[PDB]
RNA sequence: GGCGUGAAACCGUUAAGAGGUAAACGGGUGGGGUCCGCGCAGUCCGCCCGGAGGAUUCAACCCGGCGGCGGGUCCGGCCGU
RNA sequence: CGCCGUCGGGCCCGGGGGGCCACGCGCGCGUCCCGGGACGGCGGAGCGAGCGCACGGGGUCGGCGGCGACGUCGGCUACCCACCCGACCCGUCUUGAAACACGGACCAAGGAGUCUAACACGUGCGCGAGUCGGGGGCUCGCACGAAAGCCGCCGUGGCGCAAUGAAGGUGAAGGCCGGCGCGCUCGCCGGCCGAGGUGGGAUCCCGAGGCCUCUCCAGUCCGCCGAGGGGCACCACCGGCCC
RNA sequence: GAGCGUCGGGCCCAUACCCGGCCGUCGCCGGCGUCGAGAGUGGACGGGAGCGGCGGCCCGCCCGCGGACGCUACGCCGCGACGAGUAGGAGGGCCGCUGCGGUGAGCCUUGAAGCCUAGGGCGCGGGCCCGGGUGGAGCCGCCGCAGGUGCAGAUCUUGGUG
């Protein structure tokens, strides 16, 4: 009738509203995508800077005949070695707190003097050492599983990290890498965001699983050689 | 109180068959055979059923009158259709869609009207 | 219903829900109230304190028959009459009052609570309690004994 | 609380001019639950004690 | 294996009501629709209480509902109690207040309608306040059962206020050894 | 002539198969036998259109007439509250 | 003071190849460098149509193809047999059973947590300060009727509403504004509502506050909402009242 | 060295660990919008002034009559981690037997019950349905109700054969 034909003249105004609504959604997420492009530029400038600083600091120390010692690294990757049956009461509780409840799954651990004395208590049950950037670069990408209510969801996208974790300013995946790698002020809630890294059994085989890595075996601290192991278990 | 009639009859009715598989409705007015809420034809005020033609050729269609409830002699009005398998396909589409009379269960009326002619034509 | 039981579930199982090791036999701890003082004092005391001994005077041929007085409180006091009368006791008249009789409804002693209706009354009873009698004197009512 | 009228049929399946108002029991709740409880117990009164 | 943890995995919360009442089964069908589709938290709580059993839905006596409606600012809201509302003959004033219950008792229906008030149920309650807007929720004395005075630490230990089980009260029933000091110990 | 149906233990013969670590059993295929199913490479079913060949009667579009659903004044009454 | 640093600060700088998710002149809205440049806004003004194709892009499709009959095609089992590897005989007591521990030759049928009372918690249903016909009576004596229906001036009674004490027995309302005495270790007199208080406390209400195309100018409106409010059930604690 | 010791690189396999299929349990969920016409993380107006642009002569549904499946609400769908079990406790059973009201316009001398079965299958399983053979007169489903209701065992009872 004359009233509905009056709205079909007004429908060209209506689909302008349909155009406009799809439109700002397009140009949010476009300029929200341009943001993620330049924050990674800033990090790729940054990790080059922090890496080459430790070379550049040491090289002008050795020139003047003086030892450089680096800061004791503040982030350790921990993977569990042994099993479940036959577990002491004191180490029962501790491996719960480090999210290592089954075998061969692991997390990151904020190193600190409160956290160091945990890792003496569970010395036979874990293998641990300071990672590299390349190791963390692989784990969040290949084995990134994150929980939201419960229910670990594979990451697969930056919208998952925008809602569940970007309360502080870490909306995308490379912000998650910087906060994990350089321990900042929000490492706690980024580390709680990740589910434990359910790795594989190692490729080459371990070495005796029980003695310390000082004793030639495999348990305990190893300080860079866990980069050698995390290529196997990934 | 149609849902009152459903919450009584949805089990413990008569002509309900539970053998080897799903329930079956087996009710005198229904298109599909399921004991369901939507394909249930004693309950609703507005029901659509098609049947065979005891004349031998054709499709008869059963609709409830909606004027007088609780008066089961006069509560049904029926009409037969014997056409050329395509106009009797559209006429049942016209009578369902071009009224408010159950726009739900359009296709199930037709698929039975589809199927019952092919049982009847050769 | 023997079709809703525990027995009909436990067929197929050997000990029928009473233990292989302890062996449900006949009457292990005696029959009934056996050994209340001896080996079931942690049951009798801590669950039925005071079960053993004497306290009081004996009374021979105790009839429940010279101690009969069903009570009432001043909540239920208006509920013996149709509340037609408490309207027509509130109808601004004078100190005219309904004579509520609790002996008719079966109630002998009138105990007390607080908060009685403001309108004046006359209660006819066999026994009163002085708090309740302080309440009927509060509203300007009266207090009549029947014998 | 709104109660229709029901006709009074003749001896031939045919209406008469008299019409009765539908009494209020036919608006009351339909509870096959309470029927299934009460029918289950009232059927049991029937039985004899049956051999010992 | 995974857990050096236990398993307390399955909650005990009631999900469908054990009752087979058709009319309760339609109020559940109506209210399970609402509580997921309104972003309201009233409609959660009523939907819990329709599930709930008959012990845990104790009856409002009529004068609790009055004394919890005359509290200030609440003269203008409508009371909702899931469960039965019975009558109190302790009181004399009955105001014109609004009531929304399951199965108001019969002598309580008259004393509302004498007072000119309005009664509803949950088929009618859903139309006015689907979100529960303007509606005070109440509930009866859940501990107010007779039984719940039996439940304490024990019936004899520091006397514990227990009401012990006994075949009838009087003299010569649970009085000598434990209930007084001269006859042994005084708990 | 303890005469209805007549199971199992056990035994008789016929048929088939096997035979040094007592028999039997689980997992795995294999061989044979058995019937079964298909019809043995020869198996798709119905839908739509553009083509070929015979017959029927529309749809529209109106008039004929029945029945039905869908709306507002409360419209024309009742009754509802 | 210089000296070392693929340093860093996007420093700046003044002229004179790579590279960059980088594109308004026409001149204006501020800063800055000695006019351009950068921008938060507007003064410039992204002069939209996505129209097409690829797709390491939200778990494979072929719009690929063959080869075989009247004794051969496929097949699964409580059928047999071969073979590899695994493999002690079931119930029972038991710290432990293949046990040099016990019962068990073999088949068929029979065969072992029941019912009444009573109490307790839990749960469904009916009623609700009430509830209950359970014992009787009324219906015509109608197969099912040894059922069912009714009573109510049949509610006697049971259980509950009230407790405590050996017993005589007594038997559960305070709060607010004034007054009288030395207004005190101190009780009484008159109004006005009438079950106290504190911390917790689901839900509900009030919500400052901003949020949606030029602009003003205006009421509905949806959602977020700081903080605030009367506060259920219930728990912890104080006060009070009866014996 | 096929011994002992100190060792290196390979290589071997567990129901463990990774990844994938599947069942079930548990948690957290979703659809009454069956809406081919609904599209709302913000939506109506008539005003007083405006330009980006539809018409400057610088002034205002329907060629098609059409569109799959769903939703036993105790139905279905989605995502995720989980599974050992004696004594024991709960839950689900369209598991079976026998009897009773209800229903199946059920079933059958044109062959019911049973019983046998190198016959065809279904279910994880309890157990069932189908064919063939025997026999010759009654029997089973579904919703409820009620059990003297489910065997390998008791130096089991009685019967029967090695
Ligand atoms: Mg070990
Ligand atoms: Mg290898
Ligand atoms: Mg090794
Ligand atoms: Mg057991
Ligand atoms: Mg037990
Ligand atoms: Mg012992
Ligand atoms: Mg025992
Ligand atoms: Mg005794
Ligand atoms: Mg596991
Ligand atoms: Mg014979
Ligand atoms: Mg014979
Ligand atoms: Mg015969
Ligand atoms: Mg043994
Ligand atoms: Mg011996
Ligand atoms: Mg033996
Ligand atoms: Mg023996
Ligand atoms: Mg037997
Ligand atoms: Mg009970
Ligand atoms: Mg009495
Ligand atoms: Mg298990
Ligand atoms: Mg059967
Ligand atoms: Mg059967
Ligand atoms: Mg029997
Ligand atoms: Mg028996
Ligand atoms: Mg056994
Ligand atoms: Mg024996
Ligand atoms: Mg012999």
Tab-separated table of N, CA, C and O in Angstrom, chain C residues 19-108:
chain	number	residue	atom	x	y	z
C	19	UNK	N	29.038	-57.406	53.522
C	19	UNK	CA	30.436	-57.547	53.850
C	19	UNK	C	30.958	-58.959	53.811
C	19	UNK	O	30.372	-59.861	54.404
C	20	UNK	N	32.065	-59.161	53.107
C	20	UNK	CA	32.744	-60.442	53.191
C	20	UNK	C	33.418	-60.629	54.533
C	20	UNK	O	33.316	-61.700	55.131
C	21	UNK	N	34.060	-59.589	55.048
C	21	UNK	CA	34.998	-59.779	56.144
C	21	UNK	C	34.276	-59.877	57.473
C	21	UNK	O	34.535	-60.782	58.267
C	22	UNK	N	33.351	-58.959	57.731
C	22	UNK	CA	32.697	-58.930	59.024
C	22	UNK	C	31.636	-59.988	59.199
C	22	UNK	O	31.364	-60.381	60.335
C	23	UNK	N	31.027	-60.449	58.091
C	23	UNK	CA	30.082	-61.563	58.058
C	23	UNK	C	28.843	-61.319	58.903
C	23	UNK	O	28.862	-61.658	60.082
C	24	UNK	N	27.862	-60.575	58.381
C	24	UNK	CA	26.560	-60.377	59.025
C	24	UNK	C	25.974	-61.675	59.546
C	24	UNK	O	25.482	-62.484	58.758
C	25	UNK	N	25.997	-61.884	60.861
C	25	UNK	CA	25.597	-63.208	61.302
C	25	UNK	C	24.192	-63.312	61.849
C	25	UNK	O	23.259	-63.644	61.120
C	26	UNK	N	24.015	-63.003	63.120
C	26	UNK	CA	22.688	-63.164	63.676
C	26	UNK	C	22.262	-61.946	64.469
C	26	UNK	O	21.312	-61.251	64.107
C	27	UNK	N	23.012	-61.671	65.534
C	27	UNK	CA	22.783	-60.681	66.572
C	27	UNK	C	24.122	-60.477	67.257
C	27	UNK	O	24.372	-61.092	68.298
C	28	UNK	N	25.013	-59.652	66.696
C	28	UNK	CA	26.386	-59.610	67.214
C	28	UNK	C	26.505	-58.916	68.549
C	28	UNK	O	27.177	-59.425	69.446
C	29	UNK	N	25.874	-57.769	68.717
C	29	UNK	CA	25.991	-57.054	69.965
C	29	UNK	C	24.856	-57.342	70.918
C	29	UNK	O	24.481	-56.480	71.715
C	30	UNK	N	24.281	-58.532	70.839
C	30	UNK	CA	23.149	-58.862	71.679
C	30	UNK	C	21.834	-58.495	71.027
C	30	UNK	O	21.763	-58.054	69.880
C	31	UNK	N	20.761	-58.675	71.783
C	31	UNK	CA	19.424	-58.368	71.303
C	31	UNK	C	18.865	-57.151	72.012
C	31	UNK	O	18.782	-57.129	73.241
C	32	UNK	N	18.457	-56.164	71.240
C	32	UNK	CA	17.685	-55.075	71.798
C	32	UNK	C	18.572	-54.127	72.537
C	32	UNK	O	19.531	-53.605	71.986
C	33	UNK	N	18.269	-53.918	73.811
C	33	UNK	CA	18.982	-52.959	74.645
C	33	UNK	C	20.034	-53.643	75.492
C	33	UNK	O	20.215	-53.299	76.658
C	34	UNK	N	20.705	-54.643	74.935
C	34	UNK	CA	21.652	-55.438	75.697
C	34	UNK	C	22.889	-54.624	76.042
C	34	UNK	O	23.470	-53.971	75.174
C	35	UNK	N	23.278	-54.670	77.316
C	35	UNK	CA	24.491	-54.050	77.800
C	35	UNK	C	24.487	-52.550	77.664
C	35	UNK	O	25.392	-51.975	77.060
C	36	UNK	N	23.449	-51.907	78.181
C	36	UNK	CA	23.427	-50.461	78.150
C	36	UNK	C	24.488	-49.872	79.051
C	36	UNK	O	25.262	-49.006	78.640
C	37	UNK	N	24.572	-50.376	80.275
C	37	UNK	CA	25.567	-49.907	81.219
C	37	UNK	C	26.957	-50.438	80.935
C	37	UNK	O	27.933	-49.814	81.357
C	38	UNK	N	27.085	-51.578	80.257
C	38	UNK	CA	28.401	-52.195	80.165
C	38	UNK	C	29.171	-51.789	78.917
C	38	UNK	O	30.175	-51.081	79.007
C	39	UNK	N	28.703	-52.188	77.749
C	39	UNK	CA	29.484	-51.967	76.550
C	39	UNK	C	28.826	-51.048	75.545
C	39	UNK	O	29.427	-50.788	74.506
C	40	UNK	N	27.642	-50.512	75.832
C	40	UNK	CA	27.038	-49.481	74.994
C	40	UNK	C	26.790	-48.193	75.775
C	40	UNK	O	25.784	-47.523	75.559
C	41	UNK	N	27.676	-47.841	76.705
C	41	UNK	CA	27.508	-46.564	77.387
C	41	UNK	C	27.889	-45.385	76.506
C	41	UNK	O	27.326	-44.301	76.663
C	42	UNK	N	28.803	-45.564	75.553
C	42	UNK	CA	29.105	-44.469	74.642
C	42	UNK	C	27.954	-44.248	73.665
C	42	UNK	O	27.838	-43.177	73.064
C	43	UNK	N	27.065	-45.223	73.512
C	43	UNK	CA	25.842	-44.968	72.771
C	43	UNK	C	24.762	-44.417	73.679
C	43	UNK	O	24.127	-43.423	73.338
C	44	UNK	N	24.521	-45.060	74.821
C	44	UNK	CA	23.440	-44.626	75.700
C	44	UNK	C	23.713	-43.262	76.294
C	44	UNK	O	22.921	-42.337	76.127
C	45	UNK	N	24.839	-43.094	76.954
C	45	UNK	CA	25.275	-41.733	77.164
C	45	UNK	C	25.803	-41.238	75.832
C	45	UNK	O	26.155	-42.041	74.974
C	46	UNK	N	25.749	-39.922	75.627
C	46	UNK	CA	26.011	-39.150	74.413
C	46	UNK	C	24.880	-39.307	73.387
C	46	UNK	O	24.823	-38.531	72.447
C	47	UNK	N	23.930	-40.213	73.565
C	47	UNK	CA	22.761	-40.059	72.712
C	47	UNK	C	21.451	-40.083	73.474
C	47	UNK	O	20.503	-39.414	73.073
C	48	UNK	N	21.381	-40.797	74.583
C	48	UNK	CA	20.186	-40.815	75.417
C	48	UNK	C	20.579	-40.508	76.846
C	48	UNK	O	20.615	-41.412	77.684
C	49	UNK	N	20.895	-39.253	77.160
C	49	UNK	CA	21.429	-38.952	78.492
C	49	UNK	C	20.354	-39.053	79.556
C	49	UNK	O	19.257	-38.515	79.404
C	50	UNK	N	20.667	-39.778	80.622
C	50	UNK	CA	19.761	-39.887	81.743
C	50	UNK	C	18.857	-41.082	81.725
C	50	UNK	O	17.867	-41.098	82.460
C	51	UNK	N	19.181	-42.097	80.938
C	51	UNK	CA	18.270	-43.210	80.779
C	51	UNK	C	18.184	-44.077	82.028
C	51	UNK	O	17.165	-44.739	82.235
C	52	UNK	N	19.186	-44.032	82.898
C	52	UNK	CA	19.289	-44.940	84.034
C	52	UNK	C	19.183	-44.167	85.337
C	52	UNK	O	19.999	-43.281	85.595
C	53	UNK	N	18.208	-44.525	86.173
C	53	UNK	CA	18.144	-44.053	87.542
C	53	UNK	C	16.776	-43.528	87.902
C	53	UNK	O	15.804	-43.683	87.158
C	54	UNK	N	16.690	-42.898	89.070
C	54	UNK	CA	15.439	-42.363	89.585
C	54	UNK	C	15.562	-40.887	89.924
C	54	UNK	O	16.643	-40.403	90.261
C	55	UNK	N	14.437	-40.173	89.859
C	55	UNK	CA	14.420	-38.763	90.238
C	55	UNK	C	13.367	-38.407	91.289
C	55	UNK	O	13.650	-37.613	92.188
C	56	UNK	N	12.142	-38.926	91.184
C	56	UNK	CA	11.061	-38.260	91.902
C	56	UNK	C	10.143	-39.019	92.846
C	56	UNK	O	10.379	-40.190	93.153
C	57	UNK	N	9.098	-38.343	93.330
C	57	UNK	CA	8.077	-38.996	94.134
C	57	UNK	C	7.186	-39.875	93.278
C	57	UNK	O	6.848	-39.536	92.143
C	58	UNK	N	6.781	-41.003	93.852
C	58	UNK	CA	5.822	-41.882	93.208
C	58	UNK	C	4.422	-41.337	93.415
C	58	UNK	O	4.115	-40.768	94.464
C	59	UNK	N	3.572	-41.499	92.413
C	59	UNK	CA	2.173	-41.145	92.568
C	59	UNK	C	1.329	-42.303	92.084
C	59	UNK	O	1.379	-42.666	90.907
C	60	UNK	N	0.576	-42.887	92.996
C	60	UNK	CA	-0.214	-44.063	92.712
C	60	UNK	C	-1.539	-43.634	92.124
C	60	UNK	O	-2.117	-42.642	92.574
C	61	UNK	N	-2.016	-44.404	91.141
C	61	UNK	CA	-3.295	-44.187	90.471
C	61	UNK	C	-3.351	-42.789	89.861
C	61	UNK	O	-4.266	-42.009	90.110
C	62	UNK	N	-2.305	-42.447	89.118
C	62	UNK	CA	-2.254	-41.168	88.424
C	62	UNK	C	-3.319	-41.168	87.349
C	62	UNK	O	-3.247	-41.937	86.388
C	63	UNK	N	-4.320	-40.331	87.530
C	63	UNK	CA	-5.348	-40.121	86.532
C	63	UNK	C	-4.989	-38.887	85.724
C	63	UNK	O	-4.523	-37.890	86.279
C	64	UNK	N	-5.252	-38.916	84.422
C	64	UNK	CA	-5.061	-37.695	83.647
C	64	UNK	C	-6.299	-36.821	83.748
C	64	UNK	O	-6.764	-36.275	82.744
C	65	UNK	N	-6.818	-36.650	84.953
C	65	UNK	CA	-8.227	-36.359	85.087
C	65	UNK	C	-8.527	-35.288	86.104
C	65	UNK	O	-9.630	-34.740	86.083
C	66	UNK	N	-7.618	-35.013	87.025
C	66	UNK	CA	-7.702	-33.878	87.917
C	66	UNK	C	-6.670	-32.819	87.568
C	66	UNK	O	-6.499	-31.857	88.320
C	67	UNK	N	-5.960	-32.984	86.458
C	67	UNK	CA	-4.981	-32.011	86.003
C	67	UNK	C	-5.326	-31.499	84.617
C	67	UNK	O	-4.446	-31.102	83.857
C	68	UNK	N	-6.604	-31.508	84.278
C	68	UNK	CA	-7.058	-31.158	82.940
C	68	UNK	C	-7.309	-29.656	82.863
C	68	UNK	O	-8.277	-29.155	83.443
C	69	UNK	N	-6.449	-28.939	82.140
C	69	UNK	CA	-6.691	-27.533	81.817
C	69	UNK	C	-5.990	-27.208	80.508
C	69	UNK	O	-4.778	-26.961	80.476
C	70	UNK	N	-6.710	-27.238	79.401
C	70	UNK	CA	-6.140	-26.735	78.153
C	70	UNK	C	-5.989	-25.227	78.201
C	70	UNK	O	-6.910	-24.505	78.578
C	71	UNK	N	-4.824	-24.755	77.789
C	71	UNK	CA	-4.474	-23.353	77.917
C	71	UNK	C	-5.036	-22.538	76.761
C	71	UNK	O	-5.629	-23.071	75.826
C	72	UNK	N	-4.844	-21.221	76.839
C	72	UNK	CA	-4.911	-20.352	75.671
C	72	UNK	C	-4.031	-19.146	75.963
C	72	UNK	O	-3.736	-18.825	77.113
C	73	UNK	N	-3.564	-18.512	74.903
C	73	UNK	CA	-2.824	-17.274	74.954
C	73	UNK	C	-3.678	-16.179	74.346
C	73	UNK	O	-4.730	-16.435	73.760
C	74	UNK	N	-3.217	-14.945	74.497
C	74	UNK	CA	-4.013	-13.815	74.060
C	74	UNK	C	-3.880	-13.540	72.577
C	74	UNK	O	-4.494	-12.591	72.087
C	75	UNK	N	-3.082	-14.311	71.852
C	75	UNK	CA	-3.184	-14.260	70.404
C	75	UNK	C	-4.518	-14.839	69.961
C	75	UNK	O	-5.351	-14.148	69.366
C	76	UNK	N	-4.763	-16.094	70.320
C	76	UNK	CA	-5.930	-16.837	69.884
C	76	UNK	C	-7.206	-16.425	70.584
C	76	UNK	O	-8.245	-17.035	70.317
C	77	UNK	N	-7.146	-15.437	71.479
C	77	UNK	CA	-8.265	-15.136	72.365
C	77	UNK	C	-9.477	-14.636	71.590
C	77	UNK	O	-10.616	-14.961	71.934
C	78	UNK	N	-9.248	-13.876	70.525
C	78	UNK	CA	-10.338	-13.385	69.699
C	78	UNK	C	-10.880	-14.419	68.745
C	78	UNK	O	-11.875	-14.154	68.070
C	79	UNK	N	-10.239	-15.559	68.643
C	79	UNK	CA	-10.552	-16.500	67.594
C	79	UNK	C	-11.603	-17.498	68.011
C	79	UNK	O	-11.905	-18.418	67.247
C	80	UNK	N	-12.159	-17.352	69.205
C	80	UNK	CA	-13.231	-18.243	69.610
C	80	UNK	C	-14.563	-17.769	69.062
C	80	UNK	O	-15.449	-18.581	68.779
C	81	UNK	N	-14.693	-16.466	68.878
C	81	UNK	CA	-15.932	-15.828	68.496
C	81	UNK	C	-15.817	-15.520	67.015
C	81	UNK	O	-14.713	-15.446	66.466
C	82	UNK	N	-16.964	-15.395	66.347
C	82	UNK	CA	-16.969	-14.727	65.055
C	82	UNK	C	-16.461	-13.314	65.250
C	82	UNK	O	-16.836	-12.632	66.207
C	83	UNK	N	-15.610	-12.861	64.336
C	83	UNK	CA	-15.078	-11.512	64.470
C	83	UNK	C	-16.067	-10.434	64.056
C	83	UNK	O	-15.676	-9.272	63.913
C	84	UNK	N	-17.320	-10.809	63.826
C	84	UNK	CA	-18.425	-9.872	63.849
C	84	UNK	C	-18.445	-9.051	65.129
C	84	UNK	O	-18.699	-7.844	65.092
C	85	UNK	N	-18.168	-9.681	66.271
C	85	UNK	CA	-18.322	-8.986	67.545
C	85	UNK	C	-17.212	-7.986	67.808
C	85	UNK	O	-17.444	-6.982	68.488
C	86	UNK	N	-15.999	-8.244	67.324
C	86	UNK	CA	-14.932	-7.290	67.582
C	86	UNK	C	-15.050	-6.055	66.702
C	86	UNK	O	-14.524	-4.995	67.056
C	87	UNK	N	-15.741	-6.161	65.570
C	87	UNK	CA	-16.141	-4.963	64.840
C	87	UNK	C	-17.160	-4.178	65.655
C	87	UNK	O	-16.993	-2.980	65.907
C	88	UNK	N	-18.211	-4.854	66.116
C	88	UNK	CA	-19.249	-4.231	66.922
C	88	UNK	C	-18.834	-3.989	68.363
C	88	UNK	O	-19.650	-3.491	69.142
C	89	UNK	N	-17.613	-4.354	68.747
C	89	UNK	CA	-16.998	-3.796	69.941
C	89	UNK	C	-16.122	-2.597	69.626
C	89	UNK	O	-15.810	-1.817	70.532
C	90	UNK	N	-15.704	-2.454	68.373
C	90	UNK	CA	-14.985	-1.275	67.927
C	90	UNK	C	-15.901	-0.208	67.372
C	90	UNK	O	-15.406	0.803	66.869
C	91	UNK	N	-17.218	-0.393	67.436
C	91	UNK	CA	-18.115	0.543	66.772
C	91	UNK	C	-18.452	1.712	67.698
C	91	UNK	O	-19.624	2.045	67.897
C	92	UNK	N	-17.405	2.296	68.303
C	92	UNK	CA	-17.400	3.609	68.970
C	92	UNK	C	-18.476	3.761	70.045
C	92	UNK	O	-18.868	4.878	70.389
C	93	UNK	N	-18.950	2.649	70.600
C	93	UNK	CA	-20.228	2.684	71.302
C	93	UNK	C	-20.073	3.285	72.693
C	93	UNK	O	-20.457	4.433	72.930
C	94	UNK	N	-19.420	2.545	73.585
C	94	UNK	CA	-19.187	2.873	74.987
C	94	UNK	C	-18.245	1.802	75.517
C	94	UNK	O	-17.608	1.088	74.734
C	95	UNK	N	-18.141	1.671	76.835
C	95	UNK	CA	-17.457	0.525	77.404
C	95	UNK	C	-18.201	-0.802	77.344
C	95	UNK	O	-17.881	-1.710	78.116
C	96	UNK	N	-19.204	-0.925	76.471
C	96	UNK	CA	-19.848	-2.204	76.232
C	96	UNK	C	-18.847	-3.152	75.612
C	96	UNK	O	-18.013	-2.747	74.804
C	97	UNK	N	-18.926	-4.419	75.988
C	97	UNK	CA	-17.841	-5.327	75.672
C	97	UNK	C	-18.413	-6.702	75.408
C	97	UNK	O	-19.418	-7.075	76.021
C	98	UNK	N	-17.812	-7.474	74.509
C	98	UNK	CA	-18.190	-8.880	74.395
C	98	UNK	C	-17.708	-9.647	75.606
C	98	UNK	O	-16.626	-9.400	76.139
C	99	UNK	N	-18.533	-10.575	76.057
C	99	UNK	CA	-18.164	-11.458	77.150
C	99	UNK	C	-17.673	-12.731	76.474
C	99	UNK	O	-18.445	-13.616	76.111
C	100	UNK	N	-16.367	-12.796	76.257
C	100	UNK	CA	-15.758	-13.968	75.649
C	100	UNK	C	-15.631	-15.036	76.716
C	100	UNK	O	-15.037	-14.796	77.769
C	101	UNK	N	-16.174	-16.215	76.449
C	101	UNK	CA	-16.040	-17.335	77.368
C	101	UNK	C	-15.107	-18.374	76.788
C	101	UNK	O	-15.399	-18.967	75.749
C	102	UNK	N	-14.002	-18.621	77.484
C	102	UNK	CA	-13.047	-19.611	77.020
C	102	UNK	C	-13.423	-21.013	77.476
C	102	UNK	O	-12.893	-21.995	76.942
C	103	UNK	N	-14.351	-21.129	78.428
C	103	UNK	CA	-14.770	-22.429	78.938
C	103	UNK	C	-15.636	-23.142	77.913
C	103	UNK	O	-15.671	-24.377	77.860
C	104	UNK	N	-16.312	-22.380	77.062
C	104	UNK	CA	-17.139	-22.963	76.014
C	104	UNK	C	-16.294	-23.683	74.978
C	104	UNK	O	-16.626	-24.794	74.557
C	105	UNK	N	-15.194	-23.066	74.560
C	105	UNK	CA	-14.310	-23.659	73.570
C	105	UNK	C	-13.416	-24.743	74.145
C	105	UNK	O	-12.700	-25.406	73.390
C	106	UNK	N	-13.405	-24.913	75.460
C	106	UNK	CA	-12.646	-25.967	76.090
C	106	UNK	C	-11.444	-25.482	76.841
C	106	UNK	O	-10.791	-26.285	77.509
C	107	UNK	N	-11.147	-24.196	76.791
C	107	UNK	CA	-9.910	-23.687	77.344
C	107	UNK	C	-10.140	-23.169	78.752
C	107	UNK	O	-10.930	-22.249	78.957
C	108	UNK	N	-9.438	-23.748	79.722
C	108	UNK	CA	-9.629	-23.393	81.122
C	108	UNK	C	-8.731	-22.245	81.545
C	108	UNK	O	-9.217	-21.197	81.969
